[PDB]
Amino acid sequence: IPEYVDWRQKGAVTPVKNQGSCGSCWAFSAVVTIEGIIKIRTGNLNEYSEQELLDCDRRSYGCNGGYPWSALQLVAQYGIHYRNTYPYEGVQRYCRSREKGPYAAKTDGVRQVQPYNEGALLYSIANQPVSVVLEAAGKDFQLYRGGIFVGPCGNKVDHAVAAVGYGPNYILIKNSWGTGWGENGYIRIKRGTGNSYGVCGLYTSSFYPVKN
């Protein structure tokens, strides 16, 4: 695997989104990975619906939070429409999938990255973007304006995000707080510190879609 990976220089990442007030980060995170794998397999970059996971994953708690792994199973069993067909509302409605016609994409399952393992995360990112969680509740995280973020933060992971690259000293994260946060919506979190949690808990639970 190479020293730098940035899926944006491969055209596999869509613009930065803003989830709003709704605790819909789990849905945001999942759709990053799905836009990623479908580009990698088909050579096309598409935007998919966070609002359909919001409404339709039963497992997760709508605007109160939820699970990128439940969302990514829903897309493996059923599929997902495009974003322009089932646009973001930032409120949980009921599941409208059956109304919006046949799914635009379906994936073939979901895998877990082995947790607490920087190298297994780096090797997964070198393959495609990955859904990751971290502790975002801290002020230092919220106030982040750019540079390689080192904390402070703990590991009471609370927020799902997508890892779309890495370098020698960082992992490159697409967040869902719009472009005025961070580096135009992105954060570079420090890696290689030897905290098996990863900085802010980054190594706690990572999942990626499987598409043949």
Handedness of CA 208, 167, 190, 182 (dihedral sign): negative
Q: How many CA atoms lie within 13 A of 197 on its CB side?
A: 11
Q: How far apart are CA 13 and CA 197, in angstroms?
A: 26
Determination method here? X-ray
CATH code of the domain in which 7 resides: 3.90.70.10
Residue numbers in the known binding site for E64 are 25
The maximal CA–CA distance of the chain, rounded, in angstroms, is 49
Run of H or E residues at 39:
helix 25-42
Q: How far apart are CA 10 and CA 31, in angstroms?
A: 17
Q: Residue 161 corresponds to which tokens in the numbers above? A: 């995000």
Q: Residue 35 corresponds to which tokens in the numbers above? A: 């836009």
Q: How far apart are CA 193 and CA 199, in angstroms?
A: 8
How many domains does one find in the chain?
A: 1
What range defines the domain where residue 72 resides? 1-212
Contact 17, 28 (CB under 8 A): yes
Active-site residue, from 22, 25, 56, 153: 25
Q: Residue 60 corresponds to which tokens in the numbers above? A: 């997760």
Query: Where do we find the tokens 């990623």?
Result: 36
Q: How far apart are CA 197 and CA 10, in angstroms?
A: 29
The DSSP letter of residue 98 is: G
Clarify whether 175 is annotated catalytic.
Answer: yes
Q: Name the 3-class secondary structure at 92.
A: coil
Q: Name the 3-class secondary structure at 150.
A: coil
Active-site residue, from 56, 153, 159, 200: 159
Query: 3-state DSSP: the chain helix, strand, coil percent, rounded to 5?
Result: 30, 20, 50
What residues contact residue 136 under an 8 Å CB cut-off, 6+ apart? 142, 153, 158, 159, 200
Nearest CA-CA partner of 211 in 123, 126, 111: 111
The resolution in angstroms reads 1.6
The DSSP letter of residue 8 is: G
Contact 10, 67 (CB under 8 A): no
Partners of 160 in beta bridges: 133
Nearest CA-CA partner of 153 in 167, 180, 170, 135: 135
Measuring CA to CA, how many Å separate 35 from each of 4, 143, 168, 185?
Answer: 21, 28, 26, 17
Q: How far apart are CA 96 and CA 87, in angstroms?
A: 11
- How many helices and strands (H and E) does the chain possess? 5, 8
What residues contact residue 1 under an 8 Å CB cut-off, 6+ apart? 122, 123, 126
Contact 63, 24 (CB under 8 A): yes
Nearest CA-CA partner of 129 in 176, 190, 174, 159: 174
List phi, psi (to 5°) of 6: -145, 110
Helices 68-77 and 25-42, axial angle in degrees (round to 10): 50
Nearest CA-CA partner of 131 in 18, 201, 31: 31
Q: Residue 132 corresponds to which tokens in the numbers above? A: 């990751």
Residue numbers in the known binding site for leupeptin are 25
